[PDB]
Amino acid sequence: PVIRSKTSARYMELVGWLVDKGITSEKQWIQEDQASYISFNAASNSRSQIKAALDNAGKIMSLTKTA
Amino acid sequence: PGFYEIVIKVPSDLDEHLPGISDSFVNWVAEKEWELPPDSDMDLNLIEQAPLTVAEKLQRDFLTEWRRVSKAPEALFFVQFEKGESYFHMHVLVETTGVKSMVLGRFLSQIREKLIQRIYRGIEPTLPNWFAVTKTRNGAGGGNKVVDESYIPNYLLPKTQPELQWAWTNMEQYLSACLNLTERKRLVAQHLTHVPVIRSKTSARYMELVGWLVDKGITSEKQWIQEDQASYISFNAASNSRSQIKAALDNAGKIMSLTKTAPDYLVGQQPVEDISSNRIYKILELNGYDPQYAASVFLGWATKKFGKRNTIWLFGPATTGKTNIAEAIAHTVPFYGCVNWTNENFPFNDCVDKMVIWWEEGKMTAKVVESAKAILGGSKVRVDQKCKSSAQIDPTPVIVTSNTNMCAVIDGNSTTFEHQQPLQDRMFKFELTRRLDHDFGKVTKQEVKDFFRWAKDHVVEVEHEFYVKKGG
Amino acid sequence: PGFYEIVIKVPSDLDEHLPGISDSFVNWVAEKEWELPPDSDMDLNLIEQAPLTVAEKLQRDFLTEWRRVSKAPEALFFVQFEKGESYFHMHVLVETTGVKSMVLGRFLSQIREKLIQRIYRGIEPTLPNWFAVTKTRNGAGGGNKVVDESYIPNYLLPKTQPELQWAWTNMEQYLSACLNLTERKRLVAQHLTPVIRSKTSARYMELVGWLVDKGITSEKQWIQEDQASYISFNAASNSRSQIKAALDNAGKIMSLTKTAPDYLVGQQPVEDISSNRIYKILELNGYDPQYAASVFLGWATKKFGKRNTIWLFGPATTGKTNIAEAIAHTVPFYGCVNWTNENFPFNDCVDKMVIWWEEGKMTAKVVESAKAILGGSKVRVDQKCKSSAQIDPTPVIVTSNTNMCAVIDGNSTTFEHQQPLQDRMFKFELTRRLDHDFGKVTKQEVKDFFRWAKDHVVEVEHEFYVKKGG
Amino acid sequence: PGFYEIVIKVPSDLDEHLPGISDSFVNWVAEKEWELPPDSDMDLNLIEQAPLTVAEKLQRDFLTEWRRVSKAPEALFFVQFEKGESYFHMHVLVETTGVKSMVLGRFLSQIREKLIQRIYRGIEPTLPNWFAVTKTRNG
Amino acid sequence: PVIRSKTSARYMELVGWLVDKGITSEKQWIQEDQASYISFNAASNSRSQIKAALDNAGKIMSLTKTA
């Protein structure tokens, strides 16, 4: 299935925009744009979301795409 | 433009929901037959008849009352008659033009009363909350849910023939998708293919606080109180505000770890009007060195302008116009670290995750001479740590303030001089032999800031050499 | 000088937009040919012929009528004949000289009627809104838009062949940019080149302020000053989620801001120093109380640096602990260095203003950090079950009876770090024992001693042995 | 001493707000000019012309009608013409002496009728409530 | 400063009754009035409040009263 909501669509768009630039960890986020980083880090549920997004992007890049 | 999701339950059982209804109403509702348009692939057998007419009358009266009470006949709307699992309802949508959130409650009650007095003719439906508006939270807590245009293709259009019955809307972008599954599916697919930040009153202030903190140079709780104790206390009243302090501190640290150059924080803002009063000026003029040339050399060394020769070495006994300036610089910069010359295995243990490498009364070691030459010659290298993993040390301006000849690189229980020329061709020799008086006073951070700023107001041609020109 | 943006649609299809037009007009529209200037890179094939004549006549008559209704023949203008996606239009621009913004509709209608009666000969174009003025807001609620000279190179000049057909203007700076893409692009490239208010936070701020004013060190003093407040703030659902935070915040605020000398300075002057217990202890032992008082004044005010430490050496029960017992009770916060714990000896000394060392014994595990702490130098040390913390230069006092220079290292001792420690303290020789009727030192006695010290300042010489009493 | 906050929305477009206006009015509004007084440092280029004359005529007739209906020509007042982003609005203030809050509405209606029958020459501006008084609550 | 609320007043009355009746442990509460003990031991949050009030009463009696 593909549940949708106001909190999941933003996360989907964020991960889709991140995987395009090849984000590795939080270090690359500040290099690209710290404004968007602090925007999401301002919330309280983003701490547990960024850690999962990093691993998800890593696992995706390694299984689908090739160097 | 936002919209309000109004829920209007369509009475399914006219005998139970509308006890005592006149027979004329039921006759007129049952005699009205409907037929889908010619270009409509929807199956009419699944769609009802009397409930369809009831929903049509209800939504028509609702739209009429809304246009009459809001004075906005050109307002957009989107009605969709569906069939719930146990009762019929409608996902009515009306724009917020001319109707604020603090007046919607009264208009809803007025429209409900008008519908009960006109359609049902006084008889009020006995359904659990037959007329209400979607809220951001269940109960009387959350407020009116002001959805967006993306809510239509995200919940209404995805529904197909089984749950769909009819729909009415004046928007030009959802005209053919009223009674056509193909158009609805096409719009849903287009919306999914089309699809970042979030705007909130609680995050907007945090985004400015994190930017003001880095501007003021705060990297801990003491620095926050140094500016204003009341301001710091205001941002730590509740647990949510307390965790915010730690989050902001961590983010500010990780950001400062990736600025662009150290001088970005050391260089002052406003110019200098009296440099003679600065202690650095007197320290440089007493040892026999042109303050202007020394300031230019310091600016070029801190800005990574020399590259290979981007290093300064203050010679002469300890505390001779060498230790005071270095201590002031270390106290001014956010983080610092003293090179542990005693620990030849991991002398850079204290210089981990630091912006400046300070060598206070310490001799050069041969165990980290090759790796240190890379950072001194403008090159990156990942050195080890004391019981910790390695870490890349980007080209950072190193400052040496020792008394013994640094060329005598020690290699354990002996001494060598093979690294004399290699280390001398990438450092500046500052023969600061003059000793400061007991009443000289320690240099402050504002003094270092003013010195670094004046270094920019009076720039001179800095020559890449070993021996720095003295004050003639 | 501003300009008015008046849109004028050019009827393309003369049969549909101008029904009933005479054949003579169509003949003139189709016969009049046009040709770009010699220095024009635009393609004439893409530019239509019939609409160009109509646009030229329209703009000419419009300028002629404007120069008459405004009384400004030398006014600047800028016309650009373009081609929309489904209808032709012109971005006519006229200066605001002569004609105002409020009295514009009348002149516009008059010019439209004249243009009709002249070119179209009574027949009015059937194009929806074929003659109007660009408003400041999309709708029936906005005044006439008054653009500026910068509006041309930021909207009209960027446009290209698929859009443009012709343009007319008298400005010396925009003549070559009317029928030339190179000049248009050149001009386009040259012109472009926290606090928070809340009822739940105000109470917390007021509580922090009251605690800082009264000076609540630990939780015990809270109940002493007020019990109802501690009961109310503890009755909350979170219980003890804010009490400890407020205590730590107040402690840190009072430590970083104020210091011990702020309170050690006595208020009123000393009336009799001989009656003080510290003075008697210092005099009976054969040491000039004046130098000791000056040393204490300079030590709290961290004015010695390396030698910013006192070492009251002597046998036990010789007026050594009696002074520290009062010095620690007078100051707000106090601690004790645990010499037995070689790993974390500074377990109790956490954010304290005065560090008292009772029967201290230097160890090899903290011989480096000790030299920096006692010597008035910033240094970071690892805390017990807590992160590291920098102990800023703080007055430290020792009251041991053994040799502090002896560095213990398990089942042995080394005197390598003897001179560094000897050159950073003030050794004493207090051998006289105090009687039972001497009594302990009070809190006011320390303040009186500090006041007498400030009242009698002498040169403090960096000597190992303190000057004895002559 | 209190004052009544009166607001007058000057027609931003006479052709759209005042349909059928006489030609003499437009001619007088266009041909009329003004200059900066001696003790004035405001740029005349930024200040409009026709709106200035319109506001002057409006405030003059309003003050005359108020002094005639109140029988207090020596009363205080304060008129200030503004230039809004969407439309032009005037801020008129009159003393609350000799005029109660009840008869204030009747006097306002009377002067409005006089203005629409004399100034506008029987033309009602299309702007919503072109003339009214500010209340203590938006509504 | 003092927070005002029903729970605050209830806790104040509780600690007052405790320090008046000389209660210092859970045994004395049952010895005097075993009904209030079971009444306050129902809610989960009240269990921590009981210990907090006990400690507060003990400290208050140690600071004010003497041996």
From Swiss-Prot, chains A, E:
Subcellular location: Host nucleus
Signal peptide positions (record): none
Function of the molecule: Plays an essential role in the initiation of viral DNA synthesis. Binds specifically to an inverted terminal repeat element (ITR) on the 3' and 5' ends of the viral DNA, where it cleaves a site specifically to generate a priming site for initiation of the synthesis of a complementary strand. Also plays a role as transcriptional regulator, DNA helicase and as key factor in site-specific integration of the viral genome. Inhibits the host cell cycle G1/S and G2/M transitions. These arrests may provide essential cellular factors for viral DNA replication.
Protein name (record): Protein Rep68
Full-protein interval shown: 214 to 280 of 536
Species per Swiss-Prot/TrEMBL record: Adeno-associated virus 2 (isolate Srivastava/1982)
Assembly, per entry: Interacts with host TOPORS. Interacts with host KCTD5.
